[PDB]
Amino acid sequence: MIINNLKLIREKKKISQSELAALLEVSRQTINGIEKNKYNPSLQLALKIAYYLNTPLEDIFQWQPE
Structure with missing residues (x-):
């Protein structure tokens, strides 16, 4: 996953x-x-x-071949 x-x-x-993390308020913070x-x-x-990011995953979360 070089990109994304x-x-x-x-x-x-x-x-x-x-x-x-505040979304989950869990150890996630760490x-x-x-x-x-x-x-x-x-x-x-x-x-x-x-949604918090207000940034589509799909745009960045391409397949991105190795």
Whole structure:
């Protein structure tokens, strides 16, 4: 997943990690650190935050072949 740098958008879209976490208000706040770092931003998280993000996943969440 070279592209789909959705993680980067959040900063660009001036929305804090905590804000995304605030949606869940769970340990997510901490693990959100590794989810984007280790993985691509988690899809389960993604759709729930997508609306908060106001940013379509589909545009960035392309297939993105390796």
